[PDB]
Amino acid sequence: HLEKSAVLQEARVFNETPINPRKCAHILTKILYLINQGEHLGTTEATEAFFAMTKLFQSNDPTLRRMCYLTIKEMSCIAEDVIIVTSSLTKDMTGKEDNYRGPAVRALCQITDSTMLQAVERYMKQAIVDKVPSVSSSALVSSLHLLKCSFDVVKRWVNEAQEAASSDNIMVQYHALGLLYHVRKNDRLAVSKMISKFTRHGLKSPFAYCMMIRVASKQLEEEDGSRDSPLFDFIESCLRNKHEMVVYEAASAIVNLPGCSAKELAPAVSVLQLFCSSPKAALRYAAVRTLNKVAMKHPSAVTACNLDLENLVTDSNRSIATLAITTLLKTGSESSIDRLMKQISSFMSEISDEFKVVVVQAISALCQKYPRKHAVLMNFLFTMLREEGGFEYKRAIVDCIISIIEENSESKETGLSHLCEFIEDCEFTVLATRILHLLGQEGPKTNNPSKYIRFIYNRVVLEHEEVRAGAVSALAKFGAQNEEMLPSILVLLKRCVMDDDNEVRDRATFYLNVLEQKQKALNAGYILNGLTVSIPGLEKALQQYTLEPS
Amino acid sequence: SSRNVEELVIVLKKEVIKTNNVSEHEDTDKYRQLLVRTLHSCSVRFPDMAANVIPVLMEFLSDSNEAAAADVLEFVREAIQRFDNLRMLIVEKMLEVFHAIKSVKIYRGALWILGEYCSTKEDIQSVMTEVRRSLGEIPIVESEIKKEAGELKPEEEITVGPVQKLVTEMGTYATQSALSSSRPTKKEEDRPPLRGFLLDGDFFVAASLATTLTKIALRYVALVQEKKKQNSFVAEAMLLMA
Amino acid sequence: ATCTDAEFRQMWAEFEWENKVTVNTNMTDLNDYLQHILKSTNMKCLTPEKALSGYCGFMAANLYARSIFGEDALANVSIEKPVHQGPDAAVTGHIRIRAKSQGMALSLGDKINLSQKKTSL
Amino acid sequence: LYTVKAILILDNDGDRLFAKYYDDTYPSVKEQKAFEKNIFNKTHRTDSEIALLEGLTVVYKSSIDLYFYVIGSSYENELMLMAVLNCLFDSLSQMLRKNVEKRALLENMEGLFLAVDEIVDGGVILESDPQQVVHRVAL
């Protein structure tokens, strides 16, 4: 839209005599536009524009005042001698009307630093108590920013902050309780007093409930001195107000870590609280869930199941379907795994691209996470190899192989061997590296290595350096571990492929010379099974968890 | 030509990447690399070409993009395996572009030249060390540095790390740990089979032509002759695709 | 129709041949039952994809045909004839098969077992 | 104190007609635009009050040539976020004196900038009452 240089420059006239509220306000709008449209200010011109604007604060017009608040915050850090604007902001801030009140405190407090903290306090105390949400909330968020510059000034405001807390007005309360918790904190106990005061109350403020739930979620029994229960009579453990997010947050914490135990009018150990909200619209997403629950996610899992499972199967909408998979995943557990695996199998049919990779990873990942046998995990890992053939990667060769050598290795190599029949060079560097690494390392007597060798031999020709280099070194280790093997090593290595390419040659010259020429003290030593280059954890399963409902 | 070799070297000199003309250089790494290998295969074929190839290869390097050096270093290092202590001269040129780095290839190749060539030079702690504490992509770097870094003459270098510091380094880079060249970039090796261990065992006689890395480095795996694709690539890289 | 190693290789790459079966009576080499049967499902055993030695030496045939079915047909017959202390399944061969949508792949897979008819009226 | 991660009002490509970042996670244009393109690609051509992108619940709506965004946490739900998104749509409409399209926003770039800052303040929900925002802002 605009050019940052021209607009930053023409702003310098304010610094002199011209104040023209219309022109300057426009020029300011343009600054906000340069940022908004996406541009970056030049520092000299910015510094100049900032000193100029402060003159403009003399003229009190509500649109010009507004421009001035956003522009000084954005230009504050890329400007010098900004301190002059504090006075002008205080002058504005005391002026009655929400346009000035709220927006000024926020602009002022952002620029304000511990020296300046003292100045804003009278005006701040007046602005915080307001049940007019703009002035009070802006002043409450403003105080949060100020805790950094100077803690002590902000702390004095705890009384005004508390005063706002008593509102049932959603903003004034959300901001008031949230801010207070941050402010008054010198020990757990004083914050806990602040929370108990509001705690017995059936708010109509969902945001306050939410911010507070978080403070509350841990068992607090020192709220306002002491009390005999972790009790929260505001939805956290109670269900005084129904509204699917608040209900979900509260229900997952309380069930197996009581914020209070179950009440007839407020389940808080029982699985119920989520579930009564569970059949719903788009809204259902919070409601349908789970997490924790008594004693497991599984009795819980059954309720909600109709909802999560029908959307997940039906909707090939990304937005719905994602909520449906996350919701299935949540109602899941060790038990649930039979059900979870069929659904996840089914899911890729709706969204099949990355989502395909993810379901074939998920079915394996779930089998590793939630035990349906380690073998089945390998069998799923074969299905992943089959379906994608390339969205397995390098980290997969290391993870599959390490995981495999817990039990599967003879089978895995063999499966891999079959899998290698796929596609000669589009199968990728990685599969060839897996059959190669596994055939090298196991040294098949489970199947004849000759199929494996014949399969790998073709793949190497037309695939990347790293695998061809891999293939010579593996062969060498394969030699040292099994005597039998040496004749195949020689036909393979003399070839222009497994040696005498580039990287492949260098490694080969070394690996070959050590096997061929040298004692093989070194070769022998080197093979301890013929293992991978690193043994990490089991990476796939967490990756897969986030990746599927994206 | 002589066979094909003579006129292929001339022809390759024109095609392969330089600082001379930027109508014959390109920042796509495989094509550049292939072109280095085609020029270089002529030497492997016929001797006369070795003498022509090495100075042209140094011009290839002079481009001084991370990648441009990289491709250059990768073939020339193969040529040295063929051409034992004949390309001593190149090492000093080859180090130069090793410092600005964003790729694997440059590290691999450079570490191999500088490594094999150590008797000739004495720079090596200084050159290697900027890279060893620099980043880019380093998987395959490990493999190539592992067999490579110590080599040739036991104590014939020194800048603040003699050839022995290099063997120390060479071992750390392979899979060990050691303060030397301000630590290596990575240690964890390339593709699963390769590992550190063979070379770690090795360097019986510390980076010296005997029966160590140096031996391997100054020798070429199997037969290497002609354009039968044994350290060769079979004519000029562009004609071959067809 | 027939292929050379380059055409076979190109087609391998071109479309998948992961599909395999193991066919009994592939105990024998490429030349004997397997060629004759493969011939009748208008196929032919051409070039190799093998890598033989003292540990390796499955017989490998690269097959081709160009079926009047809108597909080609290709396969590799690997004959698992022991050249190791641990064979796959001993004598027998696993035929890795394809066709262009693998609708003739299957024909290759079973028509390399057995095949004979006679009457004597 | 935090609900809203960011607010974006995007054309039907995901490019920045507007975004104002109530996160500190996008200040540079390249990344602010990337974010915008990212959220628009998931959420768009499937209108609901839910989307899950980047592990965060994204609440969105649409108009003729814009998709309107609130991104917030996913420990919540659509409805909490939706109240911000409804304010965002509504307040801009009443403010500009015309419904949110690319044309209304461009028509009054100033009304749009000011109105959004009143709705979200550094990721806390400052205001959510459309009426309040509009009176609060002066064109």
UniProtKB/Swiss-Prot annotation, chain A:
Its main location: cytoplasm. The keyword Transport applies. One of its GO terms (cellular component) is COPI vesicle coat. Keywords: Cytoplasm, Cytoplasmic vesicle, ER-Golgi transport, Golgi apparatus, Membrane, Phosphoprotein, Protein transport, Repeat, Transport. It is found in: Cytoplasm, Cytosol; Golgi apparatus membrane; Cytoplasmic vesicle, COPI-coated vesicle membrane. The coatomer is a cytosolic protein complex that binds to dilysine motifs and reversibly associates with Golgi non-clathrin-coated vesicles, which further mediate biosynthetic protein transport from the ER, via the Golgi up to the trans Golgi network. Coatomer complex is required for budding from Golgi membranes, and is essential for the retrograde Golgi-to-ER transport of dilysine-tagged proteins. Oligomeric complex that consists of at least the alpha, beta, beta', gamma, delta, epsilon and zeta subunits. Interacts with ZNF289/ARFGAP2 through its C-terminal appendage domain. Interacts with EGFR upon EGF treatment; interaction is essential for regulation of EGF-dependent nuclear transport of EGFR by retrograde trafficking from the Golgi to the ER. The coatomer interacts with KDEL receptors; the interaction is important for retrograde trafficking of KDEL-bearing proteins from the Golgi to the endoplasmic reticulum. Interacts with COPB1. Interacts with TMED10 (via C-terminus). Belongs to the COPG family. This is Coatomer subunit gamma-1. The chain holds residues 21 to 570 of 874 of the full protein.
Swiss-Prot record, chain B:
It comes from the Eukaryota. Predominantly expressed in the upper one-third of the oxyntic mucosa and in most regions of the pyloric mucosa. Ubiquitously expressed including platelet, liver, heart, spleen, lung and kidney. HEAT repeats lie at residues 48-85. It comes from Mus musculus (Mouse). Keywords: Acetylation, Cell membrane, Cytoplasm, Cytoplasmic vesicle, ER-Golgi transport, Golgi apparatus, Membrane, Protein transport, Repeat, Transport. Proteolytically cleaved between Ser-180 and Ser-181 by CAPN8. The keyword Protein transport applies. Brefeldin A induces dissociation from the Golgi of the beta-COP and presumably the other coatomer subunits. This is Coatomer subunit beta. One of its GO terms (molecular function) is structural molecule activity. The gene is Copb1. Signal peptide: none annotated. The coatomer is a cytosolic protein complex that binds to dilysine motifs and reversibly associates with Golgi non-clathrin-coated vesicles, which further mediate biosynthetic protein transport from the ER, via the Golgi up to the trans Golgi network. Coatomer complex is required for budding from Golgi membranes, and is essential for the retrograde Golgi-to-ER transport of dilysine-tagged proteins.
Swiss-Prot record, chain D:
This is Coatomer subunit zeta-1. Belongs to the adaptor complexes small subunit family. One of its GO terms (biological process) is retrograde vesicle-mediated transport, Golgi to endoplasmic reticulum. The coatomer is a cytosolic protein complex that binds to dilysine motifs and reversibly associates with Golgi non-clathrin-coated vesicles, which further mediate biosynthetic protein transport from the ER, via the Golgi up to the trans Golgi network. Coatomer complex is required for budding from Golgi membranes, and is essential for the retrograde Golgi-to-ER transport of dilysine-tagged proteins. The zeta subunit may be involved in regulating the coat assembly and, hence, the rate of biosynthetic protein transport due to its association-dissociation properties with the coatomer complex. It comes from Mus musculus (Mouse). It is found in: Cytoplasm; Golgi apparatus membrane; Cytoplasmic vesicle, COPI-coated vesicle membrane. Keywords: Acetylation, Cytoplasm, Cytoplasmic vesicle, ER-Golgi transport, Golgi apparatus, Membrane, Protein transport, Transport. The keyword Nucleus does not apply. It comes from the Eukaryota. Oligomeric complex that consists of at least the alpha, beta, beta', gamma, delta, epsilon and zeta subunits. GO terms for cellular component: COPI vesicle coat; Golgi membrane. It is a peripheral membrane protein. Its main location: cytoplasm.
